[PDB]
Amino acid sequence: EVQQPDPMRKNWIMENMDSGVIYLLESWLKAKSQETGKEISDIFANAVEFNIVLKDWGKEKLEETNTEYQNQQRKLRKTYIEYYDR
């Protein structure tokens, strides 16, 4: 069963999330993207990884997780490339 590597980007879904905070967050994004010219999903990803993961996990465990992913993805891509020229 030949798993694809992840696409660069995809939709992220948070189920059953508080509406008040949804509104808070969409407001913040809209402001930040108005002040900045940058896409929402970019402001958000970046906020997620500095303000949330980096703050709580520290730079080391973050780099290790990222590395682990980069690794998995590289294997998947190699397995997928070999599977597919035939």
Spell out the domains of the chain, with CATH numbers in brackets.
1-16+18-86 (1.10.287.1020)
Q: Look-up: residue for tokens 């703050």?
A: 55
Under DSSP, the state recorded for 16 is S
What contacts 23, CB < 8 A, 6 or more positions away? none
d(CA 67, CA 18): 32
Contact 80, 3 (CB under 8 A): yes
d(CA 19, CA 37): 26
Question: What type of residue sits at position 21?
Answer: V
Query: Angle at the Cα of 58 (from 52 to 62), degrees rounded to 5?
Result: 80
Structure tokens at 16: 């059953």
CA-based nearest residue to 8, from 55, 42, 51: 42
Contact 41, 48 (CB under 8 A): no
d(CA 67, CA 77): 15
Resolution in A: 2.5
